[PDB]
Amino acid sequence: IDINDVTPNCRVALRNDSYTLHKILPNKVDPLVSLMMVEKVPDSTYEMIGGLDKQIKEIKEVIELPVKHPELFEALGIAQPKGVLLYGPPGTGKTLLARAVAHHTDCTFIRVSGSELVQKFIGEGARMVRELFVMAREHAPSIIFMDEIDSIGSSRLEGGSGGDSEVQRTMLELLNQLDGFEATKNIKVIMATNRIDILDSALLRPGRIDRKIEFPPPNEEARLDILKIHSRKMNLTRGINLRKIAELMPGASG
Amino acid sequence: MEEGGRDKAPVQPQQSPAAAPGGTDEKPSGKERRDAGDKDKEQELSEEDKQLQDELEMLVERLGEKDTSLYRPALEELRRQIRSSTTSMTSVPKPLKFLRPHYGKLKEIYENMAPGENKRFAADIISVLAMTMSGERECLKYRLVGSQEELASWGHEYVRHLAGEVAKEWQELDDAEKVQREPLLTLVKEIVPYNMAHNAEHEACDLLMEIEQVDMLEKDIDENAYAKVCLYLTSCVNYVPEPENSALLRCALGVFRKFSRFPEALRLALMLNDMELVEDIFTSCKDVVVQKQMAFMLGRHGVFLELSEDVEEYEDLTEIMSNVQLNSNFLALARELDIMEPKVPDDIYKTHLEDSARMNLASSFVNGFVNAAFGQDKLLTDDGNKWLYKNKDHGMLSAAASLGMILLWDVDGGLTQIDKYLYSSEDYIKSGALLACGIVNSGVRNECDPALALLSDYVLHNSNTMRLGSIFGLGLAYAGSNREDVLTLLLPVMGDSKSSMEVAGVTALACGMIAVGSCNGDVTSTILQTIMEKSETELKDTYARWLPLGLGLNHLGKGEAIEAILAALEVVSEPFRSFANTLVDVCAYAGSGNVLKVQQLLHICSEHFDSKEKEEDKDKKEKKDKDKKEAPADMGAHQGVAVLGIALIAMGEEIGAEMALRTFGHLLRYGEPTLRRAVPLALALISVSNPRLNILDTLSKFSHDADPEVSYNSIFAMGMVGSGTNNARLAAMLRQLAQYHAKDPNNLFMVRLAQGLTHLGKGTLTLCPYHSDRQLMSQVAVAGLLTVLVSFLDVRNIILGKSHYVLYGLVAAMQPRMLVTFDEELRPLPVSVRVGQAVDVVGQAGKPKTITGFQTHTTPVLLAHGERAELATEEFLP
Amino acid sequence: TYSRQIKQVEDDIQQLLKKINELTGIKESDTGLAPPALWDLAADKQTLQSEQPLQVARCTKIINADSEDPKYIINVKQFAKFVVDLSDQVAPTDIEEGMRVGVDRNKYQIHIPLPPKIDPTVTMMQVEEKPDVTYSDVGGCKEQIEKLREVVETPLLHPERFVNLGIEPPKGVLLFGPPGTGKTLCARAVANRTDACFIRVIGSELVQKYVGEGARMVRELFEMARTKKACLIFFDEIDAIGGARFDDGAGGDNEVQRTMLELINQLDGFDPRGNIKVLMATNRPDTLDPALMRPGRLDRKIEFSLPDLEGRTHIFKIHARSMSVERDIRFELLARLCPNSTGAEIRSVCTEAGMFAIRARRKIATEKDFLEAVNKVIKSYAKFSATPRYMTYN
Amino acid sequence: ASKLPLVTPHTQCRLKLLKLERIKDYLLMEEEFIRNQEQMKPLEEKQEEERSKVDDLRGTPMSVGTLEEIIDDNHAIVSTSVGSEHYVSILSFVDKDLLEPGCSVLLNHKVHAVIGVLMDDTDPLVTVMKVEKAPQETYADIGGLDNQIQEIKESVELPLTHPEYYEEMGIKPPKGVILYGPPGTGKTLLAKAVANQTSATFLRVVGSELIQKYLGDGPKLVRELFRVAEEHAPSIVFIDEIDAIGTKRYDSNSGGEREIQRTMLELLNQLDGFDSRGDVKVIMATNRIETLDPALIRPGRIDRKIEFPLPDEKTKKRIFQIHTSRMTLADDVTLDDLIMAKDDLSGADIKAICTEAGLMALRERRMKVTNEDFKKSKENVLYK
Ligand SMILES: Nc1ncnc2c1ncn2[C@@H]1O[C@H](COP(=O)(O)OP(=O)(O)OP(=O)(O)O)[C@@H](O)[C@H]1O
Ligand SMILES: Nc1ncnc2c1ncn2[C@@H]1O[C@H](COP(=O)(O)OP(=O)(O)OP(=O)(O)O)[C@@H](O)[C@H]1O
Ligand SMILES: Nc1ncnc2c1ncn2[C@@H]1O[C@H](COP(=O)(O)OP(=O)(O)O)[C@@H](O)[C@H]1O
Ligand SMILES: [Mg+2]
Ligand SMILES: [Mg+2]
């Protein structure tokens, strides 16, 4: 057995009396795979989009372009955008429109929620939060996605507001890191929330977030499009007149 | 790239040399005109030392190098003016055109002949035009020409004048580092006959500038530390007039001529003393110089300053004779005792906070150590007197002598204090009282008891070892005087050829510390006595510790080594009986650079397995390797430490396992963490398989250094480990003595033997027996306790700055910092980088520290060294 | 002249020296190998004098005993407990219960006693070093220095006059005042001049994660202190380990009260610590507990206050005696220009004057530099000043 | 190895040649003496036999343990991974100088005797908060200030570059520096420039990470951070947005507002304790200085306070000139029109406007930017 074949963090077989190296076992599952199987994000693609063409264009111009074509940005001599924020009423498409984008451009999709089951897959103690980058920069073209919980999306304030231990302060730390002190490129951050007027002032400075996209509730045409998309998975009958069904709904959500 | 266009020189002037072969004949005007025009253009471009690649000298190497090489010899029609324009044009490019070994090919352009007065045209360069030519000529051409044939043709006749002109011109434009390169060329050319170069440079230095003299003298003294014996003598005789003839200070020449006394000749020292006595220069400078001319650097200077004007000018020699020691004692007990010195510290004995006669004997040494700086005790050592009637009769004598050691440097009432307990009529009490009286009057050099009281004790030597305990004190009290009367008186004691071998050994040690130079009859008598006694005997090394030591001390302080060779030829015997072969050889090598000589001396037997055949020779070689440390220039220390580690500690059974740490004490005495941790590694460990007593001696030499620091408490921790292991009777006394000696009081820690600036130090002679005192077993019971305590007593206690005026008005105005360790710097050469200190007291100035002045003081008395600068008042700075 | 030859010779000599060092073979050190010159003699003797002659000798704890026969009960952390006896060479006198002992691997026999546990996070607090400040640069507070040294050092230095006079010296002392006054510097000086231990501890180190840990740490500290002869403990920022018992409503901040109660209990009742002297410092003493400030624990209450007029002159003189200034600078005027200031401000004034001198080119700081440094440091920075709201200790 | 630092000649003088010759002669004599026993009385291989037998004694199965206590007579108590601890002996070829409690010690498998000391395993937090390479270009990209730069230089750069000016007149460099002012004014950019230019190791941390979700974890973080900073090298510690540790409260914190006080006390202890500090420089930055504890910013901890005011018209024009140096501007656009866009416009708005205008030009596939691009960009950015 040659040493150069013995890469770190590998499975081997050791004899009994002398504990000498004997073989090399097939492999071990990486922590990223375990974490993503625990989270279970329901991946999708572009064909499951209803009435979100302009949003697709806007997010394509910021996420897809400065990876495949950096020379196009270097010609104009401008900085490459790094952060995107998405806001709108809940159940409108934001996570689906960030997973489809991540899937089509072949990027490693990572999401963080501050839980504690996955804490063993990041670090033993993880006193800080930037340690995730150690696991991220080895999958260079990656995307980090964090969604604001209903504590502010639905419950807003607890009586005096104050600060949210989740989401916002983590994003502040991440955006402070990759603002000049980061060497690795092709790492980006996506934010999802609602009612942007409750964001803290430190995150509304012009130089922090490079684009903000809106997700209004669907109108009649978008509702009909979603009904058409989601009516395929059932044995249907010829002639349903889905226009009337779409008109009945007073535009609640998607 | 691009070629041509702007290169006007490489077009017309390059084709002109090509057509020169057709222009050699029927064109005499052009051959000079083109040369002059090219020389003028080159001089215009070369007026600045910034464009090395000249358009004519550097661009001609494509094809004109051969033309220049083929100019003088391939013409056959050179004139008396064309030859100058040929040699001048060929000497510039040929020096750099050739390869690295170009010093042997400089004779084809410049060394062949001197064209006109090229030194006039060489003032526009630093080391390119003519300085480079002179250096190249002196490197190889003049070195082979002038080695034994200095008188030769123009290659050596005008070569010397050109070299002198170049040396003058180096220190003629700015007196920059080129002036320092001038001394290098003066030393390289005629190194053995450096007197001619020194004489040539003295004329330039005297008339050059008033401020260009101190730096040259400092550089000369800096480079005087390494040269051949004849070269060293020439350097010491050439730098003497630098501070006396060219300079008018008239005070650093007599002080700096100490290195010209032992190395060159005694006659030089006598002439310097006579000149200093003749050149009175009123009294201030002469008195300041002569104050430290009694026992600080040299002695026997109180007999040549007794001129016919002994009123105010020549009478000060009397103050040097006897008043100097009393003044030193008064200063030690006046400015230090009234500031920080208590009546009785006694702090070492109380350290055992956190029963045999050995403890009683070590108590005397502890009391003496803590009773330093005129620590007179009036019945304060009653414990020693009480123990004197119980056991340890020799220990009782040591305790009695500790009373005198308490009252060090006392000649006023020390005799009465010793006589208070002297009246005992014991075979050891009389010896102890005599030793105490001798230690008390150390350095006085007065006629108190030359043949009145000391002779009274010597005339009753019909008894035991009391006879031997009556010559070490008398010899110590007359160590600083080389009078032949005392030496003659002490010679009959050694030559008595009686059963008192100890008396003969002490007489040899006492006389070695008195006279070490001329009067070879004493050395011959000692050798004859050794041959008569030790030949028909095979006893212990009492003879080896007295015959080799006496022979080395009697012939100590002579770098010629001819006397040592004569003694070796007259003492031809077996290597075991020739233990003085390396001892006398190293006694005559007090201070010098002898790395090659040391290697040759160790080449007789490097290892040889030490098969019990030349054990004395091996011990002498080990002691010799401890030498070459008086002025090691902080260079040989590391190599010596590495050699000791890789040769003695790495391999050894008896010689390398016992005396390997002995050389550590002689290496230095200040105390550094590296040595203190290397020795502790080999001393703290038990290593019971080896000679544990040798390990104890190793610890005693690890703590042999004085001036203890706050880390010495760690040794106290080992004291706890010494309760069960390292038995008390064999290690407790040694450990206690080592702990106490380092922290005696606060001052009087100077055991490095360095006086003023760089003095080799005769005090090492007093330390010479001490290094030979601890080389065997049985600790110290009869002989060691009588010599290990009072081996050296010539240390200057504390003070470094005082007025020492007639009224002694000024007290202290200084600012301390680290010592000066710079060689080449700007005009105000920096001293150190520890300016973070400033005090207004005259207390301890620190070992490796120097104090500067301000407020327009400038120390107008000495300004060089002395530790007792008068610092005359000046008010020229508003 | 022959610069190239000399340089080549020197380079060859250095290369030969490195090659010779490589030749001697003092190499490896990947696994922790000592240089061959060190263990050259220790190569074979230990093979037959340290491998088989020495045993593993596990460590256990005796729990109790019984009379007329040893029959000792031995407990271990992971295996079971046994009944055992001694060995031949050990006396039954020094086999007292509740202490660690050595035990065989096969027959389980006591061999040697052992020292108890130490909790290394408590062992790291020993200073083992001495700072480099003395009493000579603590000017302005001579009376406080005298009053502190009368109790901290003198009884430990000459313990014969107090015993002769039948007087028991005080034990504790507290130092309070505004921030910057000098307390920690005086503690540094005391630790420098001392000769016994110096166990330093900061209150913020006693805030642990699990319940019932601070009291354990205090117990270990006092046990380790009592083990040695007699030596000192220093508490820094004591106002973070206990203010006052105020338990109202939901129980908040009371485990720290248990830590403070253990610390209080260790200084009084049922054979107090005895020969241990503690000294504490704080900047807002108005919030400490009443039961901690009574005599018997904090007998002395030295106070550090802002210097009046001559303390400022002394601080100026001792902080600028290593300067490069002319002969005509008067410090009385500079002292009069800062009516209420601390030593830190004066040191900063000196440093800024030096920096202004260094600013352009000059080598000697002038009086105008001192005046403008005072103007820019005292008058301009008085926005922050930290002082006005701590003179009321709030 | 500092064998002989006396190379003061440093020229073609005879002094350098003489010193080199003396050192070479001493080294040659030492080498000859060392090889005399290596070639005259070897009596054994002494080169490969020693390693062979020390490997023979040291078995091939080799376990690990942690030191707990050591006794002077060359043995110590070591605890095993399982939990049992022994009273094994210490061998004599284990260079017993780096044996420290808590260090991983390599033990034998038969009798568990100490046979080696093992190196460390880096640390998964050092690489987290250590800067590897320089961020961007130096002070030439800043513009506008020209006065705070000299102060930060005097505080940081000069002692490293020229530790001689302070030694001439014996003063110490200023201890601490703090930067305050309105947001978006160039504090972090100057910190980036300092990190780029300097040569010492750079450590950074955001002040919002000093509060943890357990009791007694903030002080531990501060202690460990300063231990790392003091143990690497001459270094620089950058703590920005420190005031955020006090102006925000999170329900994830187990303790209330007292743990913040304990963290503050630990921070003051680390900044101005009584143990030797070494050589560490601290830089702080905030935009709300009125909420910090005054006792934290007393002279002797933070020595310099530097304010960053809002830019003026000249600085606005300079920032336009800086940020459009590599942009193909059409002749229609003029910077003076955009100078008076807002009364209190800041530096970040310039970069925001320029970048978003470039993006808007990129949308329509136009390389040259026009006036309408800027006109819509300023309205889209500022007015919302
Ligand atoms: N009497 C004094 N003489 C000289 N300097 C002093 C004096 N008193 C205080 N100082 C200055 O105070 C500085 C810091 O003092 P120190 O940290 O000991 O104060 P403190 O009262 O313990 O502070 P804090 O409450 O902030 O912990 C020192 O660097 C020193 O320059
Ligand atoms: N004076 C300036 N010169 C050049 N660019 C500037 C200047 N001021 C601000 N900027 C721009 O603003 C951007 C953001 O500045 P930076 O984040 O460093 O601000 P700050 O002072 O740290 O503010 P905050 O405290 O609000 O984070 C910089 O990257 C730079 O492009
Ligand atoms: N425009 C849309 N077309 C089709 N389905 C949609 C659309 N928007 C949301 N959905 C449905 O919403 C569900 C996921 O909700 P999501 O939008 O991810 O939550 P959030 O709004 O918090 O991001 C999916 O099952 C998807 O079918
Ligand atoms: Mg303090
Ligand atoms: Mg910032």
Side-chain angles (χ1 to χ4, degrees), chain B residues 135 650 836 838 878, chain C residues 37-38 40-41 130 195 229 321-323 327:
Chain C
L38 183 62
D40 49 358
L41 74 164
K130 308 290 191 93
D195 53 355
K229 279 280 194 66
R321 64 151 149 65
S322 177
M323 272 275 151
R327 314 161 41 63

Short mmCIF file of all heavy atoms in Angstrom, two decimals, chain B residues 100 135-136 139 353-354 649-650 835-838 855 878, chain C residues 1-2 4 37-38 40-41 130 195 229 321-323 327, unseen atoms left out:
data_model
loop_
_atom_site.label_atom_id
_atom_site.label_comp_id
_atom_site.label_asym_id
_atom_site.label_seq_id
_atom_site.Cartn_x
_atom_site.Cartn_y
_atom_site.Cartn_z
N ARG B 100 37.83 37.62 -12.75
CA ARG B 100 38.09 37.84 -11.33
C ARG B 100 39.58 37.87 -11.01
O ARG B 100 40.01 38.78 -10.28
CB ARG B 100 37.37 36.77 -10.51
N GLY B 135 45.08 49.29 -5.40
CA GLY B 135 44.68 48.08 -4.71
C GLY B 135 45.05 46.82 -5.47
O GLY B 135 45.50 45.83 -4.88
N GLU B 136 44.85 46.83 -6.79
CA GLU B 136 45.22 45.68 -7.61
C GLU B 136 46.73 45.46 -7.60
O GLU B 136 47.20 44.32 -7.53
CB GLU B 136 44.71 45.86 -9.04
N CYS B 139 47.67 44.04 -4.22
CA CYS B 139 47.10 42.73 -3.89
C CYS B 139 48.02 41.61 -4.35
O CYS B 139 48.34 40.70 -3.57
CB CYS B 139 45.72 42.59 -4.52
N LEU B 353 14.16 29.06 55.15
CA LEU B 353 12.87 29.31 55.79
C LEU B 353 11.73 28.56 55.11
O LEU B 353 10.97 27.86 55.79
CB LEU B 353 12.57 30.81 55.81
N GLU B 354 11.59 28.69 53.80
CA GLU B 354 10.50 28.04 53.08
C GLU B 354 10.71 26.53 53.02
O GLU B 354 9.88 25.80 52.48
CB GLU B 354 10.38 28.61 51.66
N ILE B 649 31.90 16.48 27.01
CA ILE B 649 30.63 15.90 27.45
C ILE B 649 30.22 14.75 26.54
O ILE B 649 29.71 13.72 27.01
CB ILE B 649 29.55 16.99 27.51
N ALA B 650 30.42 14.90 25.22
CA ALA B 650 29.99 13.87 24.28
C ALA B 650 30.74 12.56 24.51
O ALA B 650 30.13 11.48 24.49
CB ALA B 650 30.18 14.36 22.85
N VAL B 835 18.88 53.63 26.06
CA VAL B 835 18.90 54.98 26.59
C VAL B 835 17.76 55.19 27.58
O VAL B 835 17.57 56.29 28.11
CB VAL B 835 18.83 56.03 25.46
N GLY B 836 17.00 54.13 27.84
CA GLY B 836 15.87 54.20 28.74
C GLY B 836 16.20 54.37 30.21
O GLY B 836 15.34 54.18 31.07
N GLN B 837 17.45 54.72 30.52
CA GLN B 837 17.88 54.89 31.90
C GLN B 837 18.57 56.24 32.09
O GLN B 837 19.25 56.74 31.19
CB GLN B 837 18.82 53.76 32.34
N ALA B 838 18.37 56.81 33.27
CA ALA B 838 19.02 58.07 33.66
C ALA B 838 18.91 58.20 35.17
O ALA B 838 17.80 58.20 35.71
CB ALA B 838 18.37 59.26 32.96
N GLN B 855 24.41 68.46 30.19
CA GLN B 855 24.52 69.77 30.84
C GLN B 855 25.92 70.35 30.68
O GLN B 855 26.47 70.96 31.60
CB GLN B 855 24.13 69.68 32.32
N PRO B 878 26.17 77.20 26.08
CA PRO B 878 25.10 77.98 26.71
C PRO B 878 23.78 77.22 26.76
O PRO B 878 22.95 77.53 27.62
CB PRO B 878 24.99 79.21 25.80
N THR C 1 39.63 44.25 -1.72
CA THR C 1 40.09 43.84 -3.04
C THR C 1 39.50 42.49 -3.43
O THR C 1 38.76 42.38 -4.41
CB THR C 1 41.62 43.76 -3.10
N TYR C 2 39.84 41.46 -2.65
CA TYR C 2 39.36 40.10 -2.91
C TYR C 2 38.05 39.84 -2.17
O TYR C 2 37.92 38.91 -1.37
CB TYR C 2 40.43 39.08 -2.53
N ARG C 4 35.18 38.96 -3.58
CA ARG C 4 34.55 37.75 -4.11
C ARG C 4 35.17 36.49 -3.49
O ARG C 4 34.45 35.56 -3.12
CB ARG C 4 34.67 37.71 -5.63
N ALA C 37 23.14 13.12 21.14
CA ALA C 37 24.11 13.49 22.16
C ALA C 37 23.52 13.49 23.57
O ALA C 37 24.28 13.47 24.54
CB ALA C 37 24.71 14.87 21.85
N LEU C 38 22.19 13.50 23.69
CA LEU C 38 21.57 13.56 25.01
C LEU C 38 21.31 12.17 25.58
O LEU C 38 21.68 11.88 26.72
CB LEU C 38 20.26 14.36 24.94
CG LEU C 38 19.52 14.56 26.25
CD1 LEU C 38 20.37 15.36 27.23
CD2 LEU C 38 18.18 15.25 26.01
N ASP C 40 22.64 9.38 24.46
CA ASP C 40 23.68 8.44 24.05
C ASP C 40 24.07 7.49 25.18
O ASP C 40 24.25 6.29 24.95
CB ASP C 40 24.91 9.20 23.55
CG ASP C 40 25.36 10.29 24.51
OD1 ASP C 40 24.69 10.48 25.55
OD2 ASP C 40 26.37 10.96 24.23
N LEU C 41 24.19 8.00 26.40
CA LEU C 41 24.49 7.13 27.53
C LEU C 41 23.27 6.34 27.99
O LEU C 41 23.42 5.25 28.54
CB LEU C 41 25.06 7.95 28.70
CG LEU C 41 24.13 8.85 29.52
CD1 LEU C 41 24.81 9.24 30.82
CD2 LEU C 41 23.71 10.09 28.75
N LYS C 130 7.64 36.92 37.72
CA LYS C 130 7.62 38.19 38.44
C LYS C 130 7.56 39.33 37.44
O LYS C 130 8.45 39.44 36.56
CB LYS C 130 8.85 38.32 39.34
CG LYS C 130 9.07 37.14 40.26
CD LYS C 130 8.01 37.09 41.34
CE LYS C 130 8.36 36.08 42.42
NZ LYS C 130 9.09 36.71 43.55
N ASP C 195 8.04 37.23 48.13
CA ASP C 195 8.88 36.05 48.05
C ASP C 195 8.10 34.74 48.15
O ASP C 195 8.66 33.69 47.82
CB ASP C 195 9.94 36.07 49.15
CG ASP C 195 9.34 36.27 50.53
OD1 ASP C 195 8.12 36.50 50.62
OD2 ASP C 195 10.09 36.21 51.52
N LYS C 229 3.13 26.44 52.61
CA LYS C 229 3.36 27.03 53.93
C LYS C 229 2.46 28.23 54.18
O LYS C 229 1.57 28.18 55.03
CB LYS C 229 4.82 27.45 54.07
CG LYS C 229 5.78 26.33 54.41
CD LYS C 229 5.75 26.01 55.89
CE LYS C 229 6.94 25.15 56.29
NZ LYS C 229 8.23 25.88 56.14
N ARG C 321 11.48 60.95 32.85
CA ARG C 321 12.90 61.00 33.17
C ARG C 321 13.75 60.20 32.19
O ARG C 321 14.97 60.11 32.38
CB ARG C 321 13.15 60.50 34.60
CG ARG C 321 12.79 59.05 34.85
CD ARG C 321 13.66 58.46 35.96
NE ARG C 321 12.99 57.43 36.74
CZ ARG C 321 12.59 56.26 36.27
NH1 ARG C 321 12.80 55.90 35.01
NH2 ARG C 321 11.97 55.41 37.08
N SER C 322 13.14 59.62 31.17
CA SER C 322 13.84 58.95 30.08
C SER C 322 13.53 59.62 28.76
O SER C 322 13.29 58.97 27.74
CB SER C 322 13.47 57.47 30.03
OG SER C 322 14.10 56.83 28.94
N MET C 323 13.54 60.95 28.76
CA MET C 323 13.11 61.78 27.64
C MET C 323 14.33 62.38 26.96
O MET C 323 15.48 62.08 27.29
CB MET C 323 12.17 62.89 28.13
CG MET C 323 10.69 62.52 28.18
SD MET C 323 9.82 62.75 26.63
CE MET C 323 8.56 61.50 26.79
N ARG C 327 16.58 72.20 29.05
CA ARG C 327 16.83 72.49 30.46
C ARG C 327 15.82 73.45 31.08
O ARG C 327 15.90 73.70 32.28
CB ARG C 327 18.24 73.07 30.61
CG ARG C 327 19.30 72.29 29.85
CD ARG C 327 20.57 73.13 29.64
NE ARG C 327 20.95 73.91 30.81
CZ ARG C 327 21.30 73.40 31.98
NH1 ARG C 327 21.37 72.10 32.18
NH2 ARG C 327 21.60 74.23 32.98
#
